[model samples]
Target: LIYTAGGYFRQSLSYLEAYNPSDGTWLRLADLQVPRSGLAGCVVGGLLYAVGGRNNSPDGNTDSSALDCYNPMTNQWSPCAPMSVPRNRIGVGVIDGHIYAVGGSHGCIHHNSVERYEPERDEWHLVAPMLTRRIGVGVAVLNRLLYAVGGFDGTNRLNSAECYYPERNEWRMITAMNTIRSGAGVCVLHNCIYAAGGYDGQDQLNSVERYDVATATWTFVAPMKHRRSALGITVHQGRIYVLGGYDGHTFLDSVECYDPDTDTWSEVTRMTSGRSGVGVAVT
Candidate 1:
């Protein structure tokens, strides 16, 4: 099953959907125990783990710190140990069989905290904090290192970027993006980190950029056809695909894919409904 999860529909959402690309049909899977948005999830050891998001809180402090996992085989979600630090609007990636939770926010305040979870041991540990505090940051793993890119830094949208060296237990700065953005969809393809459309403080962006891990530099790539922020991004069959997001005017149901060989973007089939703040993974 192709698994995709995340927030939307107001308040915290915990719905799960399985899409079969062969026929383009989506099936509802088990609902998450807690409804939350701004959560980060990635597959580790063949299971889906969701970390941090906003939930329904009376005082507006619904910063969710819940750590939940889904096992498709059983069609169920089981609780894992909660994050030591509760946060939302987080980014997560996998390296060396462990899932890394990157920058996020608590309430409206951004954080630079970075943490990792060991599935084998079912434990979470703190890693080096990021150079900048952020929410809606783009994160991906390439060359065995975790990269955290542009996001909203409390006061402003950012173009700064950073990387973490797990072996060295150190975080280092890297080249900044050309445009300041937040809530951009990010993924790794062909050993390069790709950051797609996002909100740039003032407007929704259709711009995209790629970071060459070998060279430690960023280059402008073909822009997406749609300006989307907080969209789900992933690489499949060697092509980068950007999913649903909100344009400045309205929510979007459209999808697009990027071809590095041609350095071009092309429109694809539309989703059943418009969505944003969603998580997608190619199984």
Candidate 2:
């Protein structure tokens, strides 16, 4: 099953839905407690967790520090330990039973701060921070190391990338991507980390690239059919699937899948509604 939670269309949303690839149908699930966009999600211990994002409140847009957990067995959502600071466009990954929240923006400020959540204690503690502040950073775990990909700083769109060593609680700079990107969809496949379509300050990008940990390098691959940013990405059945996102001018309901074997991208069934800044996980 593939689960997608809170995201944006016209406003922040609390919608939660699951896709059954076997039947090619979608099932609506319980919504998030707080409506949000730009959240990050991952599966741990057979449960799905949605992390920090921005909420559209009565006053205006506000950052969210809320963390919510979903039990598929009960098809319900419940609050969990929240992050230390509110974050929007945060990056998340699970390592050794612990979830790490990476850089994101809080109001006008982008963050370099990072935190780790321990479900056993229902507590969140500060961890090593990234080298640079990043909003809409793409994060993925490869070989036990957490990689933070391209995003925007307050002043510029970034092409830089870095990785965190959990055991050492330290972050080190890695090779930068060829093109600057923000809100890119990232996931690991075939021992490589792929960064898909994203906004590049000038345009919504359709270009795709992947990093080879063995050689410590990034190389361009096939581009997607549609340009997008803030998309939901996950690996299912050994293929990379990128879901709904914004394409500079419009909210998109389109879905596309990449076949690493053929180095090509093909369209998949569209979603029920257009969405951007959505959180996705495969369980």
Candidate 3:
């Protein structure tokens, strides 16, 4: 099973839907308590954590610190303690049961700030900041290290990357990506970090890149079928599945799949509606 949560279709949405690979059926579940977009979510101890996102309503399209949790067994959504800093376009990774919220923006301000949520206590605490301020970054946890990838730093598109050490409480710079990208889809597969399509401030991108943890270096890979950003990404059955995102001209419902073994991308299926900021994960 796979899940896709809140994102902007025409506006901020509270829709929660699930996909069953076995039957190829999409089940619409209960909507989120708060409608939002630009949010990132992941599984932690069998619960879905919908972290900070933007409420892009006409009156207020502001970044949010909202953290909502969902239970599959109960089919219910519950509010968790809000983030210490409200932000959207942030990178999220879970390590040792705690969710780390990395670089993101508040209004026009880009942040290097970082925070962590402790599920045991239902509280958030400030952590060491990143070396660079950014938004639209992608994060993934591998070998117990938290990685922060490319994003925008207000003025320029970024390819710089970094990682956080929980024990040391420090964020250290790492090898940069080959392409300047923001809002790219990122995930770990076979011990490698895959950075998918995103924008570079000027244009949407179809380029893809891979990072090997042992070498601390990035390499180019086969590109996606569509140039996009704000897409949702996840690993399923050893292949990478990228969902809805915003292309240069329009919101995209088209989905694509990447096979690491073949180093190729093939169009798979499309979502029911075009959208950006869709949240996807394997359950």
**Per-model TM against the reference:** 0.94, 0.98, 0.97
True-structure RMSD, every candidate: 1.8, 0.9, 1.1
User: In TM-score terms, which candidate is top?
Assistant: 2
What is the TM-score (0 to 1) of candidate 3?
A: 0.97
What is the Å distance of residue 245 in model 1 from its true position?
A: 1.5
Model 2 lDDT per residue over 1-283, tens place: 8888999987898889888777989889898988999999899898899999999866688899999999999988889988999999999988888999999999998999999999988999999899999999999999889999999888898999999999899999999998899999989998999999888888999999999987899999999999999999999999998999998888998889899999999987788999999999988
lDDT of 1 by residue, 1-283 (tens): 4566767654666778766656778888899887877787688778988788777544454787778889988989999987778777788889999888888888666889989888888899988898899899889998888989999889989999898999998889998988888999889999788899999978899999988877878898888888988888877778887878888877787778788899989876676677677777765
List the candidate 2 regions with Cα displacement exceeding 4 Å: 57-59
Q: Top model by lDDT, which number? A: 2
lDDT of 1 at 58: 49
The Cα error of candidate 1 at residue 50, in Å, is: 1.4
Error of 1 at 32 (Å): 1.2
In candidate 3, which residue pairs clash?
none
RMSD of 2: 0.9
Q: Best to worst by lDDT, what's the order? A: 2, 3, 1
Superposed Cα deviation of residue 93, candidate 1 (Å): 1.1
